Amino acid sequence: MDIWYGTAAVPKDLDNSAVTIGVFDGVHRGHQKLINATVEKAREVGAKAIMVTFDPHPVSVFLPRRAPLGITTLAERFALAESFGIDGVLVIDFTRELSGTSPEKYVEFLLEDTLHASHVVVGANFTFGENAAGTADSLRQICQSRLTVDVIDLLDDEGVRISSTTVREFLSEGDVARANWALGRHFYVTGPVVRGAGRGGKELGFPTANQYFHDTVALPADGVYAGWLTILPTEAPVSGNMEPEVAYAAAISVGTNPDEQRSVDSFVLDRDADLYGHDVKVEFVDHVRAMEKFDSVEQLLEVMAKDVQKTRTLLAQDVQAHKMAPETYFLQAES
Amino acid sequence: MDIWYGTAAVPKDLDNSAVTIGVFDGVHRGHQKLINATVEKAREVGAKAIMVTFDPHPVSVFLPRRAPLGITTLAERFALAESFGIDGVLVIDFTRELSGTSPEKYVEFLLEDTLHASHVVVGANFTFGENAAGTADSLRQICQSRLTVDVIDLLDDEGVRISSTTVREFLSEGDVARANWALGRHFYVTGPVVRGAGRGGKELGFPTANQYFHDTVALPADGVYAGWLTILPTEAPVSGNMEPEVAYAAAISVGTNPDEQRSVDSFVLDRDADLYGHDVKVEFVDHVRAMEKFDSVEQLLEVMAKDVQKTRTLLAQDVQAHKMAPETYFLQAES
Amino acid sequence: MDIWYGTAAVPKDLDNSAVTIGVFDGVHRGHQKLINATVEKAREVGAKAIMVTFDPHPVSVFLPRRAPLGITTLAERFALAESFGIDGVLVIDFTRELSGTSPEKYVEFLLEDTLHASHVVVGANFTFGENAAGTADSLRQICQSRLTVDVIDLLDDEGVRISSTTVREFLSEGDVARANWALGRHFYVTGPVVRGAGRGGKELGFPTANQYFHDTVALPADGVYAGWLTILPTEAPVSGNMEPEVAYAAAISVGTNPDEQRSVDSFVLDRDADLYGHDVKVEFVDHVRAMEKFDSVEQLLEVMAKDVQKTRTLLAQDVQAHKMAPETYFLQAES
Amino acid sequence: MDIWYGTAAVPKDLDNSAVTIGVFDGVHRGHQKLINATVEKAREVGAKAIMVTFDPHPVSVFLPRRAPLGITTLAERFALAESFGIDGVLVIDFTRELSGTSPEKYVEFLLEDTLHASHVVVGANFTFGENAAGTADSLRQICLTVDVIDLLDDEGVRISSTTVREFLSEGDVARANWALGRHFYVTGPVVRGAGGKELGFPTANQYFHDTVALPADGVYAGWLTILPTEAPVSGNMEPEVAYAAAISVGTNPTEQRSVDSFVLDRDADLYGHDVKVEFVDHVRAMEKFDSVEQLLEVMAKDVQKTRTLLAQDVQAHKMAPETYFLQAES
Amino acid sequence: MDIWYGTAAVPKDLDNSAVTIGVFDGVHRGHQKLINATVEKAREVGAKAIMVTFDPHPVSVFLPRRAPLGITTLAERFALAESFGIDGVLVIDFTRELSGTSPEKYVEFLLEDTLHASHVVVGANFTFGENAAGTADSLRQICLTVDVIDLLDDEGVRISSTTVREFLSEGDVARANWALGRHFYVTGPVVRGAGGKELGFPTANQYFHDTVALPADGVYAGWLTILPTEAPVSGNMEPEVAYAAAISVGTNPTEQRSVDSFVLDRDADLYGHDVKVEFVDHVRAMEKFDSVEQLLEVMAKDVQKTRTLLAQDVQAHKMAPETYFLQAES
Amino acid sequence: MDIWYGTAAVPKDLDNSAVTIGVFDGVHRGHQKLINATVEKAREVGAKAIMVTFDPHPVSVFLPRRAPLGITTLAERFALAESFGIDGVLVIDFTRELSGTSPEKYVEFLLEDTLHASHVVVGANFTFGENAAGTADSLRQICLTVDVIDLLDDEGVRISSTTVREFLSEGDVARANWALGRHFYVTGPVVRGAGGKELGFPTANQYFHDTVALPADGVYAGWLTILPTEAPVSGNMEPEVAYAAAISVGTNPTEQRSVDSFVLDRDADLYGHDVKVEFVDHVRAMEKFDSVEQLLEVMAKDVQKTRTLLAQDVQAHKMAPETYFLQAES
């Protein structure tokens, strides 16, 4: 999949495209409707399916450091776009271009001159141009004859509007199950594993993996979650009895540095391993409990054992729910 | 108007004075009663009207960094004193002098030896001398024969006690209208304009002016306010269509750095300007709304347009209320 | 009293001991039951009475920077142990040894090989060995024949469980009287006195002593307390009219730096002194009031005088309660 | 003078203009040659004299926080351009536009479509377009009359923003001033320091951010002016008069810079006012003091030396202020 | 290869082993002599080749934050040991064990009870036990065949972790590489910088913590490789190919280090990928730039010099990468 | 000894006194001449010997955070004054009083009204009143008998707070001690470091703020004393005995100072105790270590050198401690 930063990086000999445009933060189920429609039309006419997206977040251009939390990193947005069949992503920076352009010139410059589009797919909530004057309705009238426009309704399901906003609200409440339901997959983060408390292995109380994430990353509320930890493909040696590319059952503690840097510390069920130096994916399945303070090692280990018990039950159920479950996983029936 | 720092800076040949003594933070309507009485008596007897005030705040001498927030800067206290007819301000630093003096020696040294006063005006709540032993009643008895004393009742109006404390409470609640009512003018701050989000001009979403204030400055609660922005007299060129010395209608967003440094970002109605490098006065008129987070540029601009609508209405009313309104102003009837 | 850090520092020719094992944070009334039983048995058999304790806190090994607040410093734990008749303290660091040992090998290595114990005294809640598998019951069965075991019930009195946890809860609520009741003494801190607001002496509003404590130190909730300040033995000269080794009546303000560094500022009743450079012990007796903000020096001094009035009453009562009262004290009947 | 941020801010009805282009940092004597040529032409033809300049500094776009120190602020660059008769400044941000463009489309977009220029004045070192391909040579060929002006050499010294920054960093403010064609200055609010009659408390305390070019740490002779204000002044100073001053430039150790001004023969405290400090000559390097007696002695010597140096500056009145206060002795 | 943290992590059923012991920082050519001897023996006897190493660095236990800079990370130490055929690494933390022990009980506890060693390979400088009393001499007497290998001297230079750190600190990466027996490298994620087609925006921006040994600030010729990934790549680079690159090493002033790579003749942005940067030779010391023209000119000269140096590296292909991209000219 | 903060704290019924005035930082041998003369007179006449001193340092009032480093703390200044027989110290804060006053009213307010002095002893360098106008000369004329004592010169060296600070900054503690008339020392609480029997873990770890004068970074021979306490001591040290020690002075890089004491032939941990560290002579400059073997070797050499130097100090017993512990060998 091609990735272009700014209109000037798009190949001049681009022949034809079907285009979808949006922030696409999270690539949730509504976003997938736009992408699927774009891919389908591109196939039909023998064109490239192109996503136009935005980095930095358009809100951050007006209100620096008050933009919405990123449901996914830009990199994972690319990975998700590719997985749903996008052939190219054009990333637009509103501090560089297209911020002060009229709706008419926006379409002329972006859709026609740059992308040579024959079809554009946008959500009902789409806006564009100076002071957000262009709407989904405007785009339909501006693109009369010149190219076909498919405006897709926002997705309402089980009485909830699926949007980046609603996914962020679920995460903030610790309702990862509802977040997952709206995303169409397990919410996840990926990152390197650092040195933490003790060394991973025989001690139940030392995490298998310690990670830190910056305060622009959307994470579930502080607490303990059932989930799956996967060591991403690697030839580096692994300390202990975990293999790369397998989803291992884990109890995951999300915390906040006492400093809004967040910690994600994973306790892998029934395994003795230390994952320092590896890149790992952590997917969240369900909430287990709120954070609490411990007054003794005995009490700490007791609560950890209960976390393991409930995690095992939640994950045994997740494996059945199954469109989301991992293809290759490890979960023991008991300790 | 003369400004003296410490008793030693007062001219030795000072002939005669009528004196008022207090912190005078805010120079609110009660303070104005003390000042007006002092100016009147000074005129009658051909004397100088002198304010004795205190910097740092007397509370900060005992409890550093727990003094009350400054309603105005010391500099603006001077400007306000001058505007009500004070001829000289004596600024006393309790870390340097007069902290451990008996009431008797306080009067002897300050009022007689230093200021050569024939009249003193104080509020009913006045205290002085070591461990605050001197009261308004004490001053009357100590100054028998030697000089006349006028003790003025604290101001109660519309069932509220007008004091620096009550003004601070109104500001903290976001009730700038009540603060203004107690002050007898629009609450304001002045400062240099810095570089902020984007550049001021055609974009409705970029502030016309970005400012920052230290955490010792009393400001209204975080939120959006209707008010007036004035570029103070200057020969420096101005980017865009604002002229110096005119009060321009503005929607003002008061925020807090996510760090208790406060931001004041002003969106000037119907103008396209960037005020970087200029000193500006921002006066607050009324509360418009609480702060909120924005999930899209469309939503942000929508709320900003509603802020403008309500600001225009509040300011059209302010112009009529009129003892406070600015003498030279710009406010369009519509966008 | 001997203090050994780690098993390797214990004398190889140690002949015989009666041992008690625990964190012992606070050396509260329950802890004293364990210590008293250990001292008694050691005397009976002509052995050394040994405390095995832990630093860092065992919880901090698993959850760094989330361990419980220290009721006392390690140093004061030593001082308290000595005062109840302990002959030696062995300090174990679980990052260095005994963390991953089986219960059987824990007893073999620590109690037999290192301490040559003939008797061990533990609380009903005692655990030991890898993943806390050893209990008070396990210890009894493991030590069959080899050495006698006395397991002492946790102390319940007046419907409260006396534990380090309950003492910490009382302190956090500002209930120093209940904390004191559980400890069997006045809760106290000791530290050097630094330069603070003004200089101690004639001014009622300047503290006699300013102190700061790190955020790992358990202190009562922010507010004002009645208590006793003692200058610890010293030949250094003392500014003002306080003598070393006398408990002086004081109103103590506990605060928090606006930074979780805590301040303890003591206003010594009826004394004029500045304690810069001295080490001082501050013991808490009862809560007087919550913290408040002051808008004037008059108001500040008024509240301070009321603090003195209530402090004098609370301390006059404390002197009668008397098992805790200080042996040598200064408290005037009136100002 | 108008100020436009970006090409889209420029009025569409701009009928005609004479344009000069450059960073113009310091608006030194070489820059004045370009501006003077641009203004003379415009006033001759009744057209607007336009300066195209750059913020952030073009280097900082490639190397953030490794750009050269600002000889003046952008605000003072506007003030100086206006003082030399420029009618409009267009400020270009290379992170927003005119970066990836070729020389051909740079000239078409900027000079023709945006500014409708009939005349353009540039330095011999001028470059433009992607990879700095465009040169003063490349501009001439593309038609719009083009005046290319040699870089200024005087007394064997190349006058450039670089050579001015060198003089300042070395503490040689006299040479800096000679290259600038005026006294180097900074302007800013006065903050609280230590308050007067006492010789050792500064009349004014100021701090500056680390991107501001200042002379090397040391003591300098200069002039302090209170900028026009109706606000009251504590002590015996009046606004809009240049007062003789010994100026101590320092660094906050363990690079926020301090500029503390001791005004000669005046007893005043300038807290809250905006003040202009112009530097005339170097007096001495920084030193540490072990007693008050020593400090006050060296300060009296700073004053003596300052009087002499400023007396000379007044006589060679080309750069001296028009209304000033300076006593011959205490 | 297995990795065991502490003696208690080692399998109890470890029947037999050939062991080498040391800090092994950098796994330089002297270290390879020890590892090669340990591996040859084990493969001969069908036993496990074991490396006992130390984290934290033994010096840091006595002098926290005064330990020598890490030539490689502990992770790269594992990767290198595995590359030379080591079957297990035992990592010892001296704050947990083997510190207060005598030489006798060190050997008994570590080599006999834990590793069941029949052969041990150590450097002539090896010491152990409390107060570094144990020596290579003291090890021989205690029976387990012991091979003590002289420290490596080549071309009149002692090859040690110390001499490698010296070469790096001086900017002499060529000599560092000669002592290492490979190109010195670092690996890490690429972060955001300034985004391409523009020569002056780096292809990849990286930062490193202050315990990482890096060459002296300056510009170096090297190779950048995108580590194996299925993630998409922006621009015309493929994973697992070594691309020619001019690498600028810098320091965040007022010691976080930056490593910014300008990949020759490629237009790409490697944000979010993990990248290996190997250093071949020094090009130039750091310098400041006063214009874009100057910056781009020096960058073109960096590219020219880099092409030449890398051409030489390719020819002397002992340390050169197996699959690489390098153009003879623009 | 009484301690009064400000003139208003002094008892009104103070009937008579002999006064000395000065900063008295370090209470060096020149200061002792003034104090001795003041005490002898008072004890002769049965009056109080009074020292008027200054906090903050008078320089810091003019130049905050540019004052000279404190040779001792104010607390140790009180302790030293008391040790030389001073009956009261009056501490003057120049930001509170005696600043704007003339020489005449300074003497009237301080010496007559406040202290009721019949005798005053000052150094030849003494100044007072606004702008340091008052001198030792100006004091004599104003009647109160006045003894002005020359500054101390010995072995061709001027003994002053300045020359003591110079010796310390250079690492020449022997010369500092000679000028002081005692071993230079600091006192403070011992904090946690790395815990013993191990030679390389310090017996005591301390930190000091950046206003404390300390010798240059390096290793020194000295004595460590645990100050009187009933608190238990871990290991084989007793309170109130001076133990031989190798003392490492260091700086927290990227200026908090460390003082880490390795007590000879003792196995102890002094966490939580207050400790006095006195410096006798310089052993070596700081160096970096690349191995534990090297570190322990140099530490053994530090111990050997320390034994020799302290043996000499004991013999020339004028500055040596009265009760000490020092072994001739391990």
Curated annotation (Swiss-Prot), chains A, B, C:
Reaction(s) this enzyme catalyzes, per UniProt: riboflavin + ATP = FMN + ADP + H(+); FMN + ATP + H(+) = FAD + diphosphate
| pH dependence per the UniProt record | With magnesium ions the highest turnover of riboflavin is observed between pH 6 and 7.5, while that of FAD is between 7.0 and 9.0. With zinc ions a steady increase in riboflavin turnover is observed between pH 4.5 and 10, while FAD is the major product at pH 7.0 and decreases rapidly above pH 8.0.
Q: Tell me which UniProt keywords the record has, alphabetically.
A: ATP-binding, FAD, Flavoprotein, FMN, Kinase, Multifunctional enzyme, Nucleotide-binding, Nucleotidyltransferase, Transferase
Query: What SMART domains has UniProt attached to this entry?
Result: Flavokinase
Q: Which GO terms describe its biological process?
A: FAD biosynthetic process; FMN biosynthetic process; riboflavin biosynthetic process
The cofactor required is: a divalent metal cation
Pathway(s) served: Cofactor biosynthesis; FAD biosynthesis; FAD from FMN: step 1/1; Cofactor biosynthesis; FMN biosynthesis; FMN from riboflavin (ATP route): step 1/1
Q: Which GO terms describe its molecular function?
A: ATP binding; FMN adenylyltransferase activity; riboflavin kinase activity
Activity regulation (UniProt): Higher divalent cation concentrations lead to decrease in the turnover of riboflavin and the 5'-phosphotransferase activity, while the adenylyltransferase activity increases.
What EC number(s) has UniProt assigned to this enzyme?
A: 2.7.1.26, 2.7.7.2
Tell me which domain of life the UniProt entry assigns to the organism this sequence originates from: Bacteria
Record keyword Nucleotidyltransferase present: yes
Give, as one word, the top-level EC class. transferase
Matches recorded under NCBIfam families: PRK05627.1-3, ribF
Its annotated function is as follows: Catalyzes the phosphorylation of riboflavin to FMN followed by the adenylation of FMN to FAD.
Task: Write out the similarity annotation.
Answer: Belongs to the RibF family.
Annotated protein name in UniProt: Bifunctional riboflavin kinase/FMN adenylyltransferase
Q: Which species is listed as the source?
A: Corynebacterium ammoniagenes (Brevibacterium ammoniagenes)
